[PDB]
Amino acid sequence: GRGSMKFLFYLSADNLEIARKEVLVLAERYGWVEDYQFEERLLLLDYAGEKFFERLAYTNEVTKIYDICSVSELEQVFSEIPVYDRLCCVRVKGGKGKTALERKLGALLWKRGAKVSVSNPEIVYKVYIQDDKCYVGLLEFERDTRQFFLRRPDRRPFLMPSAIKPKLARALVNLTGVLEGETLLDPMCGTGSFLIEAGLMGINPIGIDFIEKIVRGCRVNLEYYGIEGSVLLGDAKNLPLRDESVRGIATDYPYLRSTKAAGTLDELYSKTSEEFERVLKKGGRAAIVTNIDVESFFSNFEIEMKTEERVHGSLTRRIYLLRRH
Numbered sequence: 001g002r003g004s005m006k007f008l009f010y011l012s013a014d015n016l017e018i019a020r021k022e023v024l025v026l027a028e029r030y031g032w033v034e035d036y037q038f039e040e041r042l043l044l045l046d047y048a049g050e051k052f053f054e055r056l057a058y059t060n061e062v063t064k065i066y067d068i069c070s071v072s073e074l075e076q077v078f079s080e081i082p083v084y085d086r087l088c089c090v091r092v093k094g095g096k097g098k099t100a101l102e103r104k105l106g107a108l109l110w111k112r113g114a115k116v117s118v119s120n121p122e123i124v125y126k127v128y129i130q131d132d133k134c135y136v137g138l139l140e141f142e143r144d145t146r147q148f149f150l151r152r153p154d155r156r157p158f159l160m161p162s163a164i165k166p167k168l169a170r171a172l173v174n175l176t177g178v179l180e181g182e183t184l185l186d187p188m189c190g191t192g193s194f195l196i197e198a199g200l201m202g203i204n205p206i207g208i209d210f211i212e213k214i215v216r217g218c219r220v221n222l223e224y225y226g227i228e229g230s231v232l233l234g235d236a237k238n239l240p241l242r243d244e245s246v247r248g249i250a251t252d253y254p255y256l257r258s259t260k261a262a263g264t265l266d267e268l269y270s271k272t273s274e275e276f277e278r279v280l281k282k283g284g285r286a287a288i289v290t291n292i293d294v295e296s297f298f299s300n301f302e303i304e305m306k307t308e309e310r311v312h313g314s315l316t317r318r319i320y321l322l323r324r325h
C-alpha cells in the first residue's frame with residue numbers, strides 16, 4: 001500500500017515562507033510528497049524517497065514521526081516505541097517541564113532495556129509539544145548552525161560590502177531545487193556567496209560578474225573552499241551561455257542606494273528577465289534578491305513565492321522564487 005513516512009520539520013523562525021518552501025522544493029525534487037501541513041514553526045510531511053535533510057538551511061531539526069498524541073498520552077506511545085541496542089536520550093521542545101518529562105520518558109525507556117545517557121546519545125527521541133499535541137519520533141537531522149557562522153563573508157580571502165550571508169545563500173540555491181551534478185548560475189556573483197553554498201552541496205557552480213577584479217576575487221574564494229567551478233567576466237544582460245543550459249539561477253541584484261536612482265535599474269531587470277528565461281531549462285527556477293518590487297519585470301515567469309526580510313528601516317529585501325512556465 002502506502003509507502004510514505006511522516007516527517008516533522010522544525011523550522012527556523014527567521015523566515016517561515018523561505019523555510020516551508022525550501023523543504024517543499026527539495027522534497028519534490030528528491031522524492032514524492034503524499035501530503036503536507038504547516039502550523040507556525042512546524043511542517044509535517046508525508047514523504048517517500050531520498051533524504052535531502054543535510055542540505056537544509058532554514059530547518060533546525062528533522063524528526064521521523066512514530067505517532068502524534070496528547071500531552072497526557074505520552075506514556076502509552078513510549079511503551080510501544082521501538083527500542084534499539086544503541087545509546088539514547090529523550091529531548092522535549094516547547095511548553096514547560098521539558099527537563100523533568102525528558103528524565104521521566106527516559107526512565108520509562110530504561111525499564112524496557114534501552115541504554116540511556118544524555119551526554120553522547122547515538123539515537124535521540126524527540127517530543128514536539130504544540131497546542132496540546134505531541135509529535136513523537138526519532139531525530140534524523142539537526143542543523144549545525146555554526147557551519148554558516150564559520151562561512152560568513154568576512155572569513156573569506158576576498159571581501160566585498162553587503163555580501164549575502166551563507167544561511168540565506170544556501171536556502172536560495174535550495175529553492176531552485178538544483179541537484180548534485182547540475183548547474184547553478186549566479187549571473188552577478190560578486191564574492192561568490194551562492195556559488196560557494198552550491199559548490200559545497202555538490203552542485204556545479206557558474207558565476208558571471210562584469211568587474212574583472214571581482215571575477216578574480218570570486219575565483220580565489222571558490223579555490224579557498226576547494227570548489228571546482230567557472231567564474232567568467234560578462235554581463236548578466238548578455239549571458240555567454242546557450243539556451244536552456246542551466247537548471248537554476250540564484251542571485252542578489254544591485255540595490256538602489258537612494259530614491260534619486262529610481263528607474264536606473266529598469267534595463268537590468270528587463271534584460272536579465274529575458275536572459276534568465278532563455279538560459280534556464282524548461283520548468284527551471286530563479287531565486288532572486290532585490291531591494292525593490294520587480295514583479296512586473298518578471299511577468300514572463302511564474303512567481304512561486306515572494307517574501308520580505310526587513311533588515312533595517314532603510315532596507316527591505318524582496319525575495320522571489322521564479323519558475324519558467
Ligand SMILES: Nc1ncnc2c1ncn2[C@@H]1O[C@H](C[C@@H](N)CC[C@H](N)C(=O)O)[C@@H](O)[C@H]1O
Binds near residue numbers: 188234252256
Ligand atoms: N549587469 C551585471 N552583470 C554582471 N555583473 C554585474 C552586473 N551588475 C552588477 N554586477 C556585479 O554584481 C555584484 C554585486 C551584486 N551581486 C549585488 C550585491 C548587493 N545587493 C549590492 O547592491 O551591492 C558586483 O560584484 C558587480 O560587479
